[PDB]
Amino acid sequence: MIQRTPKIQVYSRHPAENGKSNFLNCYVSGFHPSDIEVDLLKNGERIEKVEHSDLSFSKDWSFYLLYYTEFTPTEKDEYACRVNHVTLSQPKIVKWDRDM
């Protein structure tokens, strides 16, 4: 069967402001099959209490999920999303970048 690799986006709910509480988002989409592992990372360490949306899918039948957690963006704090799917040779890490 045809398998589709996830598209990964790491971003924040509101525009980043040092010291100001916000939401760190990892949106994973366009993947198939539905089995996926998603972790939100702070300085290379897995954030323990991360929530996700209920599995849904697009017009092209590919799946999507939103993983989220409340966070306060500091200057020295590094945030990332780590994704594992059957289509990936190794878990993919996408770092959080304020600019996109």
Binding site: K7, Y11, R13, N25, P33, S53, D54, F57, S62, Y68
Partner: protein, 277 residues
């Protein structure tokens, strides 16, 4: 404006390791209001929007029974479709179903729909008329023959242009405080040198509620749809959406590029240009 009610079901076979994982989600427009997860603690259809919570115990009992019944059909169908496509018992397979209806601003029925997939490809869909089916291949035709004989379309139509429309009208009245909202996009442009000679112009659209949007890049009127990096619309997580479009431009030529922002909650299509010094 126009509204919709849609239900989304995914059933995934877990070869040997138990019964298939079933996830059901209900939406009014782009707002989820119910859920059912075969792996969740409750084993019931659960509210996900404040305006649905006011529904009584007979409502949640009925929704639970009816969503579980869908889950059981899917369980059977996973074995049936494995038969049709001549596949082993060892692999994990997926069934996806989407069905629902649209109503206009007056609440008049606009369209009904039902589409099914097997392993992320079209399997069978009900046609626009709500009387006939379109099977994607010869195995799916077997389902079509069975449904045409059983008069399944008439049964499904009764729901899509009747039951569905009745309850969508109720949900829109019960959630009138939040569902009639449209948030227009907050637009802006950013600039990021990638070297001494080139820069990325990035056109942004944030906090818009009708998830539908159009962000295009034009170099002196002419469209740049081949050199544009467009990202998938993404949820902000508070019911609103976000999107960006980008183009790599030669440094000093920024004023030659325009970003056009078409959205429904916008009186006229917004035009953005990099305001040079």
């Amino acid at each position: 404006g126009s509204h919709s009610m849609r239900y989304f079901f995914t059933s995934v076979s877990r070869p040997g390791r138990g019964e298939p994982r079933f996830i059901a989600v209900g939406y009014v427009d782009d707002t989820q209001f119910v859920r059912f997860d075969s792996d969740a603690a409750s084993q019931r259809m659960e509210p996900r929007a404040p305006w649905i919570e006011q529904e009584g115990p007979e409502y949640w009992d009925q929704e639970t029974r009816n969503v579980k019944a869908q889950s059981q059909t899917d369980r059977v169908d996973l074995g049936t479709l494995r038969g049709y496509y001549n596949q082993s018992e060892a692999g994990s397979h997926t069934i996806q179903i989407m069905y629902g209806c649209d109503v206009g601003s007056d609440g008049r029925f606009l369209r009904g729909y039902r589409q099914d997939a097997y392993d992320g490809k079209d399997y069978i869909a009900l046609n626009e008329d709500l009387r006939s089916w379109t099977a994607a291949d010869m195995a799916a035709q077997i389902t079509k023959r069975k449904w045409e004989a059983a008069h399944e379309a008439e049964q499904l139509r009764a729901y899509l242009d009747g039951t569905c429309v009745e309850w969508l009208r109720r949900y829109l009245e019960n959630g009138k405080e939040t569902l009639q909202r449209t948030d227009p996009p907050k637009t802006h442009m950013t600039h990021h040198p990638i070297s001494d000679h080139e820069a990325t112009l990035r056109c942004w659209a944030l906090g818009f509620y009708p998830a539908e949007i159009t962000l295009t890049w034009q170099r002196d009127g002419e469209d740049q749809t081949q050199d544009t990096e467009l990202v998938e619309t993404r949820p902000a997580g508070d019911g609103t959406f976000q999107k960006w479009a980008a183009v790599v431009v030669p440094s000093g030529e920024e004023q030659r590029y325009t970003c056009h922002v078409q959205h429904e909650g916008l009186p006229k299509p917004l035009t953005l240009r990099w305001e040079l010094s």
